[PDB]
Structure 1
């Protein structure tokens, strides 16, 4: 999963880009719910939130390091099949 750092400027741009609804507004920044963050695998070849973030404050979360398979499995759990 990814995380949003303290450098987030609360621009609102990443929330509508998440296919899994993993992003919401937090206390001082936007936040990723790691149980919904597939790093976009299954939907897109690259993270959509990273693509729109104006200040590059979306990074791998080292306390949720996931393989492509784990992420895929997560994608399948969220969307079904």
Structure 2
């Protein structure tokens, strides 16, 4: 899963992430590909649908 610039940094995906791959960065939250279990729960928990 990969996050996009559409992210407004609401922090919902970060915590919801089972594997905790998602971390806050310089301009938006980011997804670590190596530890992402491809569940897609972050996409579900997003008011703007940034995680793709």
TM-score, with normalisation over the residues of structure 2?
0.92
Specify every segment of 5 or more residues in structure 2 that has no aligned partner in the other structure, as ranges. none
Runs of 4+ in 1 over 3 A off after TM superposition: none
Q: Give the number of the structure with larger relative contact order, counting CA–CA contacts within 8 Å between residues 6 or more apart.
A: 2
Find the counterpart in structure 1 of residue 5 from structure 2: 6
Does structure 1 residue 53 correspond to structure 2 residue 46?
yes
Aligned CA-pair RMSD: 0.7
Greater Rg over alpha carbons, structure: 1
Find the counterpart in structure 2 of residue 36 from structure 1: 35
Specify every segment of 5 or more residues in structure 1 that has no aligned partner in the other structure, as ranges. 41-46, 60-81
- Residues of 2 paired with 1:8 and 1:37: CA distance? 18
User: Whose helix proportion is higher, 1 or 2?
Assistant: 1
**SS of equivalent residue, structure 2 residue 2:** strand
**SS of equivalent residue, structure 1 residue 31:** strand
